[PDB]
Amino acid sequence: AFELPNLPYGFRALEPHIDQQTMEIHHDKHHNTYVTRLNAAVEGTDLESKSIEEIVANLDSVPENIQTAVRNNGGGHLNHSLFWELLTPNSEEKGTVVDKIKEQWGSLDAFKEEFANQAYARFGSGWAWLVVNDGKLEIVTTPNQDNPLTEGKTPILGLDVWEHAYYLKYQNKRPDYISAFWNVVNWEKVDELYNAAK
Amino acid sequence: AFELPNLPYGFRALEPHIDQQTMEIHHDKHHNTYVTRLNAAVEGTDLESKSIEEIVANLDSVPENIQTAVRNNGGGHLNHSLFWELLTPNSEEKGTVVDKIKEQWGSLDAFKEEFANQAYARFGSGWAWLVVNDGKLEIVTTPNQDNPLTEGKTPILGLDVWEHAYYLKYQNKRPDYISAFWNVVNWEKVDELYNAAKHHH
Ligand SMILES: [Br-]
Ligand SMILES: [Mn+2]
Ligand SMILES: [Mn+2]
């Protein structure tokens, strides 16, 4: 069965960029619900032994009757699992991917502009991603809990732009949330995900 | 140009079922953004003189360069315009549609159960609707700001299940929001929309 991973920090560790009420409800309620419904679908099937990454990457090996449950709750589990590890109270804009971003976009600032534009433009619920696409850094967004793995793209940074991720602190103000996010990005985790793509 | 409609009650009128902070932000910010972007898309074109009902029912015909903006922002404008008039501080569970619902589902409660189930199951952003679909009552849900009119179904009740509609008061507890919603449904508006639906064509 899949396990709800602990946050790597206390609920208050990302203040004042993300509020502790959100960190608690987002993790203990929203992510936990994805794990409940994912397990209800996959527990007792030949998918149960597989990594969530293998499953989400290969949704056409999911039998038709649970395909939607797995895509949505499997996606929910993978996306939130990545997100918690991609946040930190000790953010430093350094390392492999930051250097590659400066190289490709000319500056980290230009990168943040495009990331924020794409994240802002995602209509309804979804995610903004920095992915590796056959060696190439690319910014994409996905609806709901869809994940670039399914399209053969390796996610190395993700921002949750479902309203549950920002409404308590920021309400309608998604751009302020996106701006706040830069303060808590775990670039060490980004580097790890990038290195494993290779 | 399209206009943000005035609420027919105060921001506090739907308490405790919908919180005044949400009523103000949802109307003055979320709906207003849809109106702004609809107007940015259509102003100075032949679409500016058409009803939002006509535009949304006919998204297929909207020029390709503005079709997504009109689908999302025109949808947004129609959906919220319907929603405000379908809420009331003076809800009475009676009339033509309540009577038809009792006949079809056997009780209002059985109807509420199916509606609440579909509204809860809608994954991500969207709307739960009661529609007239070729003369029969049908519960459907739509993603984002999509509207049953585009598929030739007439909406007579809608519930916003975007998280902005419920997160400040209910957070993750969408079912408690849906439960609250019944206390503020304007069945007089539902009756009016139904009656129009029967004579649409
Ligand atoms: Br801590
Ligand atoms: Mn989330
Ligand atoms: Mn809304």
Side-chain angles (χ1 to χ4, degrees), chain A residues 21-22 25-26 29-30 33-34 37 72-73 120 123-125 144-145 162-165 167-168 171-172 174, chain B residues 21-22 25-26 29-30 33-34 37 72-73 120 123-125 144-145 162-165 167-168 171-172 174:
Chain A
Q21 185 183 18
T22 295
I25 299 184
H26 199 185
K29 295 292 170 25
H30 294 267
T33 294
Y34 293 132
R37 295 175 168 186
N72 289 350
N73 299 288
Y120 178 69
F123 194 72
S125 304
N144 303 324
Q145 300 296 345
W162 289 57
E163 291 174 323
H164 65 240
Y167 216 76
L168 290 180
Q171 298 83 51
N172 56 292
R174 192 192 288 181
Chain B
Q21 185 186 13
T22 297
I25 301 173
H26 199 186
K29 297 199 183 330
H30 290 271
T33 291
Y34 296 133
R37 288 175 173 166
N72 290 343
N73 294 292
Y120 178 38
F123 190 74
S125 305
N144 303 322
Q145 297 299 344
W162 286 58
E163 285 172 327
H164 61 244
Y167 214 80
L168 292 181
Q171 300 88 51
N172 52 291
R174 191 191 293 181

Side-chain angles (χ1 to χ4, degrees), chain B residues 63-168:
Chain B
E64 292 201 280
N65 78 309
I66 62 164
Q67 195 171 306
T68 296
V70 171
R71 172 173 181 179
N72 290 343
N73 294 292
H77 175 47
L78 174 55
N79 293 342
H80 291 88
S81 290
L82 279 170
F83 189 46
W84 311 135
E85 289 293 322
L86 283 161
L87 307 168
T88 180
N90 303 304
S91 188
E92 304 181 325
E93 287 184 336
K94 66 179 192 176
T96 294
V97 172
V98 163
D99 287 351
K100 294 326 153 289
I101 284 173
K102 284 167 82 196
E103 273 177 291
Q104 180 168 332
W105 276 267
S107 66
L108 193 51
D109 273 0
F111 167 81
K112 284 180 179 172
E113 181 159 15
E114 180 180 334
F115 188 97
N117 288 349
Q118 287 207 49
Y120 178 38
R122 164 51 60 176
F123 190 74
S125 305
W127 287 79
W129 308 96
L130 182 58
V131 303
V132 187
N133 181 354
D134 295 311
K136 78 184 70 176
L137 289 182
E138 196 191 354
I139 298 166
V140 296
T141 72
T142 61
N144 303 322
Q145 297 299 344
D146 294 354
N147 182 287
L149 280 182
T150 308
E151 281 210 80
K153 301 169 208 189
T154 303
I156 71 167
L157 181 61
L159 175 65
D160 194 355
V161 296
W162 286 58
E163 285 172 327
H164 61 244
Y166 63 83
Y167 214 80
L168 292 181

Side-chain angles (χ1 to χ4, degrees), chain A residues 8-13 89:
Chain A
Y9 33 72
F11 294 136
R12 290 183 70 189

